[PDB]
Structures are given as structure tokens and as C-alpha cells.
Amino acid sequence: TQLITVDEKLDITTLTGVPEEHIKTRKARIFVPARNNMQSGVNNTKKWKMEFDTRERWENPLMGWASTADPLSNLVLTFSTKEDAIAFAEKNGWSYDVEERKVPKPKSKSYGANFSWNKRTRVSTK
Amino acid sequence: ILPGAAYTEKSATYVNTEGRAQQTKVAVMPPGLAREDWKIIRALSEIAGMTLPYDTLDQVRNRLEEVSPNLVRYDDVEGANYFQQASELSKLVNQQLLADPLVPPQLTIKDFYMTDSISRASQTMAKCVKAVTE
Amino acid sequence: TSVKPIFSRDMNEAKRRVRELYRAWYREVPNTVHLFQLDISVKQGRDKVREMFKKNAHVTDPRVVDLLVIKGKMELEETINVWKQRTHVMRFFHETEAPRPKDFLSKFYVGHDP
Amino acid sequence: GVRTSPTGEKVTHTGQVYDDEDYRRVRFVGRQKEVNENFAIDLIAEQPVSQVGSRVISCDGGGGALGHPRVYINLDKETKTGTCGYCGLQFRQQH
Amino acid sequence: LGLREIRIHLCQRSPGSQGVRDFIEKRYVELKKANPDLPILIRECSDVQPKLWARYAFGQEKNVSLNNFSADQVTRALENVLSSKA
Amino acid sequence: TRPTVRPRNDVAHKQLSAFGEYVAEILPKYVQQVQVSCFSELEICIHPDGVIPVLTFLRDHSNAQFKSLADLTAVDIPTRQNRFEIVYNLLSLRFNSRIRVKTYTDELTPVESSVSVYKAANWYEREIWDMFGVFFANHPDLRRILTDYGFEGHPFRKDFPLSGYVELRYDDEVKRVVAEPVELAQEFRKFDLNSPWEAFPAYRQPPE
Amino acid sequence: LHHAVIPHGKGGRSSVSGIVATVFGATGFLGRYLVNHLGRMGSQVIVPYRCEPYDTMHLRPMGDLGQIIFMDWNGRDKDSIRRAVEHSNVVINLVGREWETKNFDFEDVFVKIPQAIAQVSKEAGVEKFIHISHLNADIKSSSKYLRNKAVGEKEVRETFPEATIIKPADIFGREDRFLNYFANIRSLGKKTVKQPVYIVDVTKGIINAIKDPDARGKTFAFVGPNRYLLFDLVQYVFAVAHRPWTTRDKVERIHTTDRTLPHLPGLEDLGVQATPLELKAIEVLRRHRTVQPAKTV
Numbered sequence A: 001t002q003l004i005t006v007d008e009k010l011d012i013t014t015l016t017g018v019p020e021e022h023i024k025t026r027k028a029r030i031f032v033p034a035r036n037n038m039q040s041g042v043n044n045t046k047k048w049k050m051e052f053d054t055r056e057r058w059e060n061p062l063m064g065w066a067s068t069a070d071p072l073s074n075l076v077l078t079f080s081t082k083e084d085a086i087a088f089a090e091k092n093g094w095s096y097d098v099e100e101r102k103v104p105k106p107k108s109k110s111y112g113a114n115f116s117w118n119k120r121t122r123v124s125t126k
Numbered sequence B: 001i002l003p004g005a006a007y008t009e010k011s012a013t014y015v016n017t018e019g020r021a022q023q024t025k026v027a028v029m030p031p032g033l034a035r036e037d038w039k040i041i042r043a044l045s046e047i048a049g050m051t052l053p054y055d056t057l058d059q060v061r062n063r064l065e066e067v068s069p070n071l072v073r074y075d076d077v078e079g080a081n082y083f084q085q086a087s088e089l090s091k092l093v094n095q096q097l098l099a100d101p102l103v104p105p106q107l108t109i110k111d112f113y114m115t116d117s118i119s120r121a122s123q124t125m126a127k128c129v130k131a132v133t134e
Numbered sequence C: 001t002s003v004k005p006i007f008s009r010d011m012n013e014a015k016r017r018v019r020e021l022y023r024a025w026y027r028e029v030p031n032t033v034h035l036f037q038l039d040i041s042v043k044q045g046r047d048k049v050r051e052m053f054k055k056n057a058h059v060t061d062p063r064v065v066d067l068l069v070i071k072g073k074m075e076l077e078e079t080i081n082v083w084k085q086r087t088h089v090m091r092f093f094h095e096t097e098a099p100r101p102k103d104f105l106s107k108f109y110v111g112h113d114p
Numbered sequence D: 001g002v003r004t005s006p007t008g009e010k011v012t013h014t015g016q017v018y019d020d021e022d023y024r025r026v027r028f029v030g031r032q033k034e035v036n037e038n039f040a041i042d043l044i045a046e047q048p049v050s051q052v053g054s055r056v057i058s059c060d061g062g063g064g065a066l067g068h069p070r071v072y073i074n075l076d077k078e079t080k081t082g083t084c085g086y087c088g089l090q091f092r093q094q095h
Numbered sequence E: 001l002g003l004r005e006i007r008i009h010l011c012q013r014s015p016g017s018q019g020v021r022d023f024i025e026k027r028y029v030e031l032k033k034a035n036p037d038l039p040i041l042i043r044e045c046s047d048v049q050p051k052l053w054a055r056y057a058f059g060q061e062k063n064v065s066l067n068n069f070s071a072d073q074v075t076r077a078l079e080n081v082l083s084s085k086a
Numbered sequence F: 001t002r003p004t005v006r007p008r009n010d011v012a013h014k015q016l017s018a019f020g021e022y023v024a025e026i027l028p029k030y031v032q033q034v035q036v037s038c039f040s041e042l043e044i045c046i047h048p049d050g051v052i053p054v055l056t057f058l059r060d061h062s063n064a065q066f067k068s069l070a071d072l073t074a075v076d077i078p079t080r081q082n083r084f085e086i087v088y089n090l091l092s093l094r095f096n097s098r099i100r101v102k103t104y105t106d107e108l109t110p111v112e113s114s115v116s117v118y119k120a121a122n123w124y125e126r127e128i129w130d131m132f133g134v135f136f137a138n139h140p141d142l143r144r145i146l147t148d149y150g151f152e153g154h155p156f157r158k159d160f161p162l163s164g165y166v167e168l169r170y171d172d173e174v175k176r177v178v179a180e181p182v183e184l185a186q187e188f189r190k191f192d193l194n195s196p197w198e199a200f201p202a203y204r205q206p207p208e
Numbered sequence G: 001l002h003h004a005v006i007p008h009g010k011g012g013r014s015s016v017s018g019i020v021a022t023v024f025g026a027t028g029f030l031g032r033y034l035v036n037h038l039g040r041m042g043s044q045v046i047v048p049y050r051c052e053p054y055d056t057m058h059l060r061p062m063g064d065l066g067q068i069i070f071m072d073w074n075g076r077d078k079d080s081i082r083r084a085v086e087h088s089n090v091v092i093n094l095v096g097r098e099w100e101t102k103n104f105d106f107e108d109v110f111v112k113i114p115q116a117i118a119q120v121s122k123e124a125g126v127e128k129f130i131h132i133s134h135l136n137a138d139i140k141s142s143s144k145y146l147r148n149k150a151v152g153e154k155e156v157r158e159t160f161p162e163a164t165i166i167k168p169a170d171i172f173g174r175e176d177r178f179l180n181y182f183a184n185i186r187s188l189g190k191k192t193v194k195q196p197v198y199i200v201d202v203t204k205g206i207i208n209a210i211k212d213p214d215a216r217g218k219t220f221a222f223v224g225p226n227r228y229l230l231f232d233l234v235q236y237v238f239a240v241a242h243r244p245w246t247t248r249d250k251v252e253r254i255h256t257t258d259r260t261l262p263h264l265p266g267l268e269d270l271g272v273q274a275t276p277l278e279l280k281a282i283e284v285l286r287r288h289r290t291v292q293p294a295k296t297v
């Protein structure tokens, strides 16, 4: 046979070594990151990311540096699809929420529409 | 005075003018001893001996779903029907229109920059007002 | 849903392996208290073993408990063969760590963590 | 151009000084608060404005490749000088 | 001690909410004319099962499932809520 | 494209393509993909049930003789359901060549240990146990090799944080080095560096 | 409350506890464990030291960077005391000698220096002041230690009216002079009754007295859970340690029974479970090895 049938939910939380505080009190956010509106390039909007809720950052009394106590504060994960991210968060016991991908809707462009005979879409200058 | 969290300092449900529920995320934490707002009200309920049946943000949102379930379906506009029944109920008591003309409280760009407590504390908005009033 | 097993074909072989690992740890606790010259009792060390076994007591997957028994055997080999120092044995007893706030009100008083 | 707080503490060129009720002054007890007493904002004001006969001037900070990247400053405003964004030197068209 | 508000959750399109929809199109108005100072919050949503929430005095809330009712059954459940006030 | 561009080696590309076809047709039971990179490196991507038969082939076959195990490697790729990618870099001193043998596993499926083929693997896959949590069946002494003795967690998994979950300090009350939850006096500053523009159009993936 | 002294973090080494503590006598047995338990919260700890700076080295790993500030002080110099306490929100006194010296007798160590510290801490605006007397302090005591410590307790109470005064009975620990005295004496058996208290219990009580606003002006008595006769306590010390420097004032104090003060609050009123001797005496006396427990009264 050499194959067993495990009909249970996949759960590796006892094997990851993550302490309980950072399994059951964390909210994973699964999202495609928004395009930086300083720029027109879209190559950062191609993958799904997983991040966590930001915890407390405070001021170091000596230097004024940003002291943290959150180990997961920099943990950003990359996924090809939404279902891979959902499956990875369910496998690790993370409570998650998913934002759907926002695509830009197809616009209707026409250079001649800048010079219409009777429509408001004339450009006053060019 | 109970120091609370601002919109950048809490994961928090806000519903816009079209009924779409949306949630902020925590960007930074509230300064000093300030706390998240329902945490303050829930701790006040526990001090008063009338402890409200939620402990976490998800349980507050379960209560929020119990009062109206649209408040937890994010980026969704639930359509509201029944204009006819509201219009029939509006025909009951005939209130009289005043003779005052419809004047909005914001006529110029001067009135735009300071409306809430964050904008009134804003030095940039103060410079915008001083720049448009000169 | 047909997966390759590690050691156990089902959960009963898995419980057999959990049980033998618990027997080996239970026998090992007095020797661990003695030769690491710990400040705990043998009963307190066996309580910590029972606590660590009950911590994983909700798992229903045979492969996950096979890996838990494998990692427990590894920790046991690191304890019998004196590879751990006293500090690695005493890390199960979070003694210098101050107790965390457990209820809502004290977590409200100390900060922002839910 | 250093001044002093009423606590007796030197204000840095940023403007940093601890409050009187701030406990973090205790790190300077028996020791010193190291400030630099050559304020760059006070030294770049001491430079003379260069009167040039052109409309666009170039600044590299001097020294050629030992200065900053070479930028071009327009001098069309006769109200105000044209200041280099790197070194802080300022220029005026002589007409 | 007494009823304070009523909350009626329903769907716009689900057939299990249809009788509840049949309640609001016909019988809500003379309900609201009968109870002018009682807030009867109608909340439509996308995929919910129908539900009647009855908040009473001092935070007490009773909970009636209006799933697959006719409009007569919604009328009877709501008038039982109005007549109970417990 | 002479001075600054790397010169392409077409002879090695053709020879490694021919040998990749050779291995793919001698062993069709386990070979899934065969690829040759543009810088002439052959990869045999196999099924994990053929770890021993493929590696025994390349070690012992008279046209392969990959007698040396250069390196054994895992890669965590969390978007795959078989997230761990086990990499066998092999060296044939007879034919002066290198091959790469790649397979996969998830957290719970064991990979067969290759200590019977290459004894060099005895520590390498042992490290793959310590760094990734990949269990290796029938390893002689499988245990941790790099982490501390009480270390929970498999660090080179990409869901493991950079600083860990614990940090040590000496405590003079208990007269002992103790482990506490990690608090950084300065947080590691995550830099989002990736440009929003496409860099390599030859690697463009087809959209959804 | 100032913004830099608002507590932050999760209570660890890099956190901010909001406690700025000037701990006089921090280089001793109690100061060791008090600075260890303060600096593990992220507290600013001013350590004024009299001794060689080498003898303060063990206090340096006890906190994050800049969290322990070492400065010189003299007991007969009020200017150094003001230099040490003027930024602190709590001042703890631990200055003590078991024996009198040529330059410092029991009145200088227990009356003059605590009154100087409490007077300067009052006139610097320090919120909290914790003083450490002894449980057996009395004006009519036979030993000069307990007489001068009762006088100094009275003067601390009258010059800092909101001082938390704490009475430990006989503190045992790894660096004590209670179990290490009996284990190295190898003076006799009398009718003396004692309840010794463990040092970590004392330290947790002091930090809970810092954190509790109800502990201002109180007089606590830190005692152990089990009272012992002196004879079977000494026999238990010799039985655990596997055995078959002093003065007459120390002899008068070992032969002085630990009084029972039920009207004073104790470790239970600060949330401290007093650890018995039977758990910690093996940890203390493991050093002295080259057991049926003692009978409680």
C-alpha cells in the first residue's frame, strides 16, 4: 500500500515552533499590494502578499530608535495566487482576512476626442 | 478624559455615504497611554460590573454583524430597496418648509480645510486657510 | 488524500509511539534532575513533561505526531547524552520571564496586545 | 552658534534639548553633552553672495569631483538669490 | 421590562427571505404607523438567513429565525414579539 | 556584445541537452523535467520516490560517474504546496561535468536519505532537518546540527522571522543564561526595494 | 506624567517601565537582585556606588544600554545625593553594614545616611521612597544594630512622611549572611524563634511596593511562611550542607527572636507568595558540599 489516508485538516502549528501568542492573536492580511501612486509602473502589483497586523513600536530611551517586540513585524510572504496564501495561512493556524485584487477597469481612450466638434471633452490647451 | 485611538491607530470599521463598509488598519500605535476606543468602553464595562460579551476585535465584529450584517462585508455595497414604503411614511406628517434659502455651510475654499478635530489641529491646514484668506 | 507515512499507518501506532516516548521521559526526569543538579524536584520535572505532552494533545494527524515523537526523541537524546547544559533544561521553566497579563483588564492596562 | 536652555544644557544645531522634568538628563550627570559648536546654518549665512554676469550659473561646490554633483541655478528672480541645493552657496545676477 | 427595538435582517434575492420581503412591501407601513416611537431596523444583506432580533430592556435580546416563513408567519412572529415585552 | 557580455558556451549546452535527454529516457519512471540554463547548467527535476534510483544511477553509470556530491540544498518556496525543493549538486570528475537533481516535499512527507549513495549527505540533509524541518527517512543519526539545543522552529523556512522568537541573556538571580522573548532596541528596518517596472521581458509570465 | 516616562513595550529588556530608580547600596546582596529585577523590565536604574568600579561590574549586564547609570557618592555628602536622586521617580535605600567600622558606625549607616537620603529626596521632589529597616528593630533592643535601625526608621518616617518602610526578617539567598554564616561556622542553641524570608520574595515585594500607589506610607513586614527554632534551623543548615568573621552584635542578633507583627502588612498584601526555605536551601547550600526538614513552630 505504502500510502495512508489522512482525512484531517492540514495543521503544522505544533511543528513550526511559533509561540502561541504569535499564532492565535495575529491577523494575517492577504492582499495584492496597491500600486504606488507616485509611479505608473505595475510590476509590484503582480503577486499576492501576506503580512501581519502592526504591533507596538516605541522610542528607545538611549538613542530614539524604533524598538519593537513583534517578531513578525517584517514577515512579508509572496504567493502566486490567492489560494496558495489562504492554504499557507490555514496550514499555520493564522486567522486571516483576504482583500480581493483590484484591477484598473479598461478605459476608453481616443486622441481625437480631445478635439470634438460639440462635446465637452475638448482640451482648452495641449 | 479617556484618551482614544485615531483612524491611523486602530483597525476600525467605517461606512461611507453609499453604505459600503470598510476597515482601517493599524499604521502606528496610539501615543502614550492612549488606547483603542472599544477597548476603553469594554474595560469600562468590566469595571462597572456590566461586562460586554466580547474580548477581541473579531468578537466585536460578530456583535456588529448581529446588529446589522452589512457592517462586516467589506468593499461591498448592499442594495437598499423599499423607497416606496419610506415615501409612504414620509407623507404622514406635513412639515412646513422654512423661508430660509438653502445655503451650504462651506461656500469657499476657506471653509474646506478645517471641519473636524484633526484638521483643526493641523498646521498644514492652518497654512492653507491663511494662504486662501490673504 | 493518500499521503506517505513517516512511521505510523494510523493513530493507534502513533499513540503507541507517544506512550513510549512519555515512558522514556518519565524514567529520565530523576537522572536529569540529578546530573544537571537542578533546583527543581523530580515531581516538578515530571509535571513539566506532562505539561509539554498535554500541550500537543489535540493533534489528529499521524504524520504530525510522528514528527512530534521524533522531535521529543531528539530532545531526549540531547538530555541523556549530556549535550544540553543546565540552561537548556531550565528553559522549559520560564522562570525569569515575568507572568503575562491574562485577563482583558490587565492587558488593557499594560498596552495594546490583544 | 550654540545657546543654552534654562536647565543649563546646550541646545544642539537641530534644536534638541531635554525638558527640565525629563529624566534623560541623568545620562549627562558627571559627564558631558557633546555638541558641535560650528553650526552649519550659521556658517553658510556668513558666505558672500556671488555676483555673476550670467543668467544660469553652475555650482559643483568647488574642488571639481571633490564637491557635489554639478547643478544649474537660474537667476531670473531679481527679488531673491539663487541658492545651491547641495552646498548652500547663493548667487545673484549682477544686472 | 419592555421591548426597545426590533431588527429584521433579510436578503434582497434569496427565496428564504421572500416572505419577509412580502412582509415589508405590504405590512411594514401600517406597522410603523402603529408604532411610531419603536425603531424597527430593516437590514438587507447579500446571503444572510432571515432573522428577527428583539432587544428588550437592560440589554436583553431575543432571537427568532424567520427563515422560509410566509408573510403570515413573519406577521405572527412579530406580533408575538410586540405582545411579549419580556 | 563582445566586451561586457558573458560569452555563451554552445558546445556545453548541446552536450548537457543530449545527456539530459539520455537521463530522461533511461529513467522515465522518475524524471519529470529536464532543463539546461543559458549559462549551461543541467537540472534533472525528479519525483521524490526516485531519490535513491536516480542518484545511484548518476553515481554508478559508466556514462555519468557523478562520484562527488558537491552540495545538498533545500529551498523554502511557500507558494507551492510542496514548499521545500531539495537540490543535489553533483560532480563527475571523469567527464568534468556538473549536474543538478531537484525534487520536492512538504512539511510532513519524508524524503529518502541518500547516505547509502553519498556519505557526504550525512550532514547536509541533517542540516536540511535543522534548517527546514524536512525529515529524512533511514538517516543513521538524524538530529540538529547548527541551532541551539533547545531551539524550537526551523529557521530557514521563510515564515521564520529574521531575529528569532527568543534571545539569550545572562541572569544573575538564577546564575544562568536564560531565554526570553526577543525585544529589539532597534527594529530591523524592512526596505521595499523592488522597482515597479519590468526588468527582464524574457521572463514575463502570462497573465490571468 | 512626562512622555519619556510613560511605560512602553512588553515589559522586557528593551522596554520602558517608567521607573527611574536611584538605588543606594546597590552593590550589596539586596541591590544585586533589585537591580536585576528592575533592569529586566527596562527601568532606568541610577546606581550610586562608593566602592571600586570593578566591584560594580556584575551590575552591568542587568539591563539594556544606558539603563544603568553609575555615579560616585559619599554618605556624608548631600550634594552627591542630590546629584543622584534629582531625576528619579523612586529612591530605594539599601545602605547597611552588619558591623561598624572606623569611619562609619551603626548611627552613620542607619540614622545619618538614611535621613540624609530621605531629606534630599524630599527636597528634590522624588515621588516614592522605599527604606529597608529590620523586623527586630526596637529602641530597647540589646544589639546596637536594631537600636540604630529603629531610630533611623523613625527619622525616615518623620522626614519623608510617604516612605514605604519594609521589614525583612532574615534574608536568605546565594550571597546571604544567614545561611552562609551558619554553614561556615562549623553560635549555640537557645530559645530563639526565626522565620527567614527569601531574597527573590523581598525583591518582588519591593518592586510591587514601587508599582502599588497604596504602598505609600505603609510599613510592611517581609517574613517567611515557616517559623523555626534556632537550633533545628542550624541543624537543618548543617544537614543540607553535608556537615557533621563575626562580632558580639551579630551574636546578639542571631539570639534575638523574630517578632510577630500581625498588624503590619506583609508579602501577601503585595501579591507575593513567600517561598519556603525547603525549596531554596539546597540551592543556597549546594556550594557548601565537598534531609528531613526542620520542625516548624
Ligand SMILES: NC(=O)C1=CN([C@@H]2O[C@H](COP(=O)(O)OP(=O)(O)OC[C@H]3O[C@@H](n4cnc5c(N)ncnc54)[C@H](OP(=O)(O)O)[C@@H]3O)[C@@H](O)[C@H]2O)C=CC1
Pocket: G024, G025, G026, G027, G028, G029, G030, G031, G049, G050, G051, G074, G075, G093, G094, G095, G096, G097, G098, G104, G108, G109, G132, G133, G134, G135, G167, G168, G169, G170, G171, G172, G176, G177, G178
Ligand atoms: N539578611 C539581610 O541582609 C538583611 C538586610 N537588611 C537590610 O537590607 C539592606 C541591604 O542588606 P545587604 O544587601 O545584606 O547589605 P550589604 O552589606 O550586602 O550591602 C549594603 C550596601 O550598602 C553600602 N554601604 C554600606 N555602608 C555604607 C556607607 N557607610 N556609605 C555608603 N554605602 C554604604 C554597601 O556598599 P559597598 O559595596 O561600597 O560597601 C553595600 O552596597 C541593609 O540596610 C540591611 O540592614 C534587613 C534585613 C535582613
Ligand SMILES: [Zn+2]
Pocket: D059, D060, D061, D068, D084, D085, D086, D087, D088, D089
Ligand atoms: Zn553648490
